[PDB]
Symmetry: D2
Subunit: 338 residues, 4 copies
């Protein structure tokens, strides 16, 4: 039926998640609270005007400590300490952790101590303790009691995994490598400034910047048969949104370009309907802004070297597509609370 | 002689100041310490590799708590609290305040309490108490004991002031307005994120963003006769460095384009030699990267409407040009300690 | 009732005009043909996928020599010589000249020789012979027989004129100056390459580039009382669309910021309803993508120096807003053919 | 000795080649003429001011039909038809074909018909007939009389080939794939405009744009043993210069990361000295502007999956690095005319 949801960290994913939610047909979610760093005024304003999604077409208003959208009112709070949040009193079942700062089991659990029952990290979990799910890959393995702290993995892993599942099922992945040409994010710097990563420290809009990614190793979390078989890197480039994955895998079953495309397209219409979009048009990155699928296979770019070495390129709106999946995963949690 | 200087905040201006210094012919400054937020390693790395200035061609090395450039060793320390700094013990005479967080007389003076004798804010001073100087405009009014907390004003004010002086001296400014088309800075956000200023909160590299500026009112600090006579706004645009000033003034002495140019040039060769550069080539913004002058008059763009309404456009490398001036001001202070 | 229209030059304005047209309530236009440089395939594809407007939500298809949108079919032709166009045979009443290459009376008239009755240049006319109109400023002065070749002026003039009309009517413009911070266009170069204008020759996305504008002088065409009273320059900056006008005028009737705003807002709700949008929100350039008005006054930026020197900043979507006006002007022509 | 050279097409590569040349220690080339599309004035102006390279520090002057750089005078001519060129009369030995329009044996040979003896295409040759050389890979196979039309291949092939040679020599390449994340070029469009390639038609600075590349198949031209063994695609991204190659190869001799790096470095100090630069610093794209090497191995990004699947990432200044190689190839030809 319905679970009460609160969003912690009203940033890119936070606001994207909200909009996705409001565009949904039906839902078992009731967003009742938002925890942010600024005021209610700033939350309503950044929710309405988005440099990438454009203006949110909806009735948006706000007051000293809440925001209202199309009639639904959501309390606004602002505590940098999750432990101080009124989750218990507000009867919060599920908190969407999208602050980027409570990604460990303990960290994210501070919301449990504060009263919530389950928390969903909109990012990879760090350390042990969190269950990871990727809609369309291991979602049938979701059990309510497994973890109070779950993760929807990263945007890159959500694009990568579905395609890896289809590629592995039909040809058998022996080993593979991947590179993601990714839009810059708020974790990078607009101009040269210190950062734990000497590369993300550099002016994002004027540099192609290499950076590590755990996305390839992470698919093992949702497709255990691929443990230690994949890896790769990331290249952050000067675009504000949408990215693309370049996956190269040595396959076990010799095949041909027309065929890997055939199965990927087959899957986009059936088993990965809604998860994998099959695009055979000569399109560019900004053409996928707002696409709901987690992986957008660009068919005309598929390539097979000597029968067993395949390359597939898949696009993804790392903000919106991902948020659609975190919505799906929350909805999945809803369809089985306690 | 020589005064002992320490840099607080090793950011853009901080590192720009250091490179400017090392490129200088002679100096009365001895930079002996740098207080930054990260480690010595990151400082040496961002000092050498710059996305805008390019590689710093010099012998740069570092250890756990110092960095060495061309044989001169500089201690590295990292305290977010200026009150904890060993200024007294390191015999610090002048501190360059380039953190962007201690811009009030009180704030900056924390350095004084910690032992420094004079502090120079590489930005406008907020509130009462700081002395303000713009090289080439009011530097002859510099007296060592007037203020322990001095300010070199903003980059925009340093470009605007020298041009205002020349225009006012020669035609008499009645009132005027200015707009600066400015490159973005680290005070802006790469993607839509909260900010005190809802406009600076919006993704910098994909927006033209309007923001307020105190630069026009501030020239009064250095040309008192212009108090209440100037005003303006700023438009941040997607370039990482160099900006341009659009100054429109109603003048008292009717004049003509050829003449305002004639006097601006005259000044660039004489009274403003080194402060104002006279450019009559059809150039664009990146052609001014690394220019030492505070103001670069684009002559072919000078315009005079009906004899008393003049418009002059002046470029400026907001990082490098400005940093050259703070070196000049630190040197000015040096040539008169006590 | 209905006039037959053909678009010559299916570029930015060309495709923008078409989409605007298809979004209109009612119309007296029937677009029946498109003359482009490439094939029908390329026309349908660039009409559907736009890096700035996003995907055109409509039924779009094409064949060897035509394109169909939501049932309406439009013949595709491709002749670099207007004189070779089948206007007479296709019974073309009005041709939308948006190739950027037939902007003179003679040039644009080649379409008349080829059979069309009236041609509308989506840009300033060059030389003598063309009538210029700016919806909301001099449209009541439109007579069918005045010119077979008309012009909708430029995007900058359409933003500037409405505001100048309101400002002049209520306070009397003595003289003024203007600067437009404008998105780059296909007339500029992505990288340093030759151009008649040594400044537009320079890499557009990495430079702020000064360039001349005739927009200020042009308002005299639609507001003759302002002949020789205005002028200005342009600054092309790294954004793909939407620009902003900065107008400074010496006024005859002393006034105050609150008041010029009051009249501008008054006009946005009445005499300039649909032409001037009054925005008092702290917004940025990409927030106006797709705005229909020709001028968007940013109120919080309005400024008045010493009572008679005013500055108003107005935004405009130089592609879409402008195209909405060329649609309006074609519709106006329609409401009075012969 | 010395051969008389003429530059056809004074664009990016054209001007880059000229600056590279002037910076060279000794030469066997004498550049005596430049054929461009605009006037001598525009050539001198774009030669001096570069948005990417910065100001050319040299004595540059020009007149109605020549330009002089550091005392060497070069005639300027402007014919779009190579067949009209005074090559015979100016005793031209070698023409540098950098227009990007005469890339077939026949096309380029128009220069030969006009009097030149050998022509060097600064791009891949299209169709049969041209000899291809990549300095450091197959330059010892250069024989003066093999071809009158030679090619220095593409920038991507020049970065890919030296790395392929080293990897193939040491581990044996069975098959492989590569993707180049490339800065945009003048063959791309600033805003959505028609193009033979519907993807290159889309606004370059606001899109990640997929495009085909012949670079991988082309290394076979210079390392025959790799015919049919490599393949790939390109992704154009919003930076104006420097690109990176992502090469994944299935190797015959199992190896480890430390080892592929060990051999790549070994080569950078010996057999590929000056062709391959070994970079083990955490740098980003703009840090490689102005690098002379054809390939810049980013060691920390080297990756080896299960011993026989290697990935190496190599940067390259697609304009400057490439131009240094065409100077090298022109010099190679010079050291063996007839
Ligand atoms: N961007 C993407 O494409 C993407 C894709 C997949 C996963 N993610 C993941 O999503 C998470 C959020 O990233 P984002 O891109 O949306 O960045 P973001 O816009 O910075 O969002 C994080 C939001 O949380 C707020 N915040 C930080 N610490 C907080 C605290 N202690 N309490 C309450 N709010 C706090 C931030 O406030 P201030 O900013 O004001 O400090 C900001 O509003 C990260 O873990 C990231 O890796 C992002
Ligand atoms: N950009 C320009 O062109 C320009 C021109 C004129 C004046 N300014 C002014 O110069 C100042 C510095 O700006 P910027 O552009 O150089 O920005 P910035 O690069 O962020 O520089 C500020 C530096 O201070 C450090 N910092 C922050 N808090 C600190 C603290 N409590 N203690 C010690 N160091 C601290 C920062 O470290 P973290 O970043 O790691 O926190 C960074 O290294 C500002 O007042 C600005 O208005 C800038
Ligand atoms: N961009 C703006 O914001 C804006 C605002 C106001 C006014 N305008 C004016 O609108 C006009 C069009 O500019 P635009 O920005 O839309 O540029 P554009 O996208 O280049 O559009 C011009 C279109 O006309 C085509 N064309 C050129 N010569 C032709 C010929 N002889 N016959 C048939 N088609 C021809 C071009 O083909 P190819 O490109 O394939 O050669 C292109 O498709 C210009 O006069 C401009 O000043 C533009
Ligand atoms: N960009 C790179 O990094 C790179 C690297 C390796 C190879 N290349 C190759 O180098 C070649 C040149 O490309 P580019 O990037 O330098 O582009 P570009 O700057 O456009 O250079 C071509 C030059 O040739 C001129 N031109 C065009 N048609 C001509 C004709 N009929 N006769 C004489 N001159 C003519 C152009 O003038 P107008 O522009 O005024 O028409 C321009 O000066 C291409 O084959 C390209 O694939 C480029």
């Amino acid at each position: 039926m319905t679970i009460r949801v609160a969003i912690n960290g009203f940033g890119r994913i936070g606001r994207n998640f909200l909009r996705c939610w409001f565009g949904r047909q039906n839902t078992d979610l009731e967003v009742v609270a938002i925890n942010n760093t600024s005021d209610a005024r700033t939350a309503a304003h950044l929710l309405e005007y988005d440099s990438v999604l454009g203006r949110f077409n909806a009735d948006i208003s706000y007051d000293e400590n809440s925001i209202t959208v199309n009639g639904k009112t959501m309390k606004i709070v602002c505590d940098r300490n999750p432990l101080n949040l009124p989750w218990k009193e507000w009867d919060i079942d599920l908190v969407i952790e999208s602050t980027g700062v409570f990604v460990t089991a303990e960290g994210a659990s501070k919301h449990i101590q504060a009263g919530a029952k389950k928390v969903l990290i909109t990012a990879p979990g760090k350390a042990e303790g969190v269950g990871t799910y990727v809609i369309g890959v291991n979602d049938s393995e979701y059990r309510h009691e497994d973890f109070a702290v779950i993760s929807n993995a990263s945007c890159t892993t959500n694009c990568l995994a579905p395609v890896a599942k289809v590629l592995h099922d039909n040809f058998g992945i022996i080993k593979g490598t991947m590179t993601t040409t990714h839009s810059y994010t708020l974790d990078q710097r607009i101009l040269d400034a210190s950062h734990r990563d000497l590369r993300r420290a550099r002016a994002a809009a004027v540099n192609i910047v290499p950076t590590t990614t755990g996305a390839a190793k992470a698919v093992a979390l949702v497709i255990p048969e691929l443990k230690g078989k994949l890896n790769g890197i990331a290249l952050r480039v000067p675009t504000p949104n949408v990215s693309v994955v370049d996956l190269v895998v040595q396959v076990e079953k010799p095949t041909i370009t027309e065929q890997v495309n055939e199965v990927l397209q087959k899957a986009s219409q059936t088993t990965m309907k809604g998860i994998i979009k099959y695009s055979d048009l000569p399109l560019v990155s900004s053409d996928f802004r707002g696409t709901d699928e987690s992986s957008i296979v660009d068919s005309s770019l598929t390539l097979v070297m000597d029968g067993d070495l395949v390359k597939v390129i898949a696009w993804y709106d790392n903000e919106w597509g991902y948020s659609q999946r975190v919505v799906d995963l929350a909805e999945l949690a809803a369809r089985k609370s306690g």
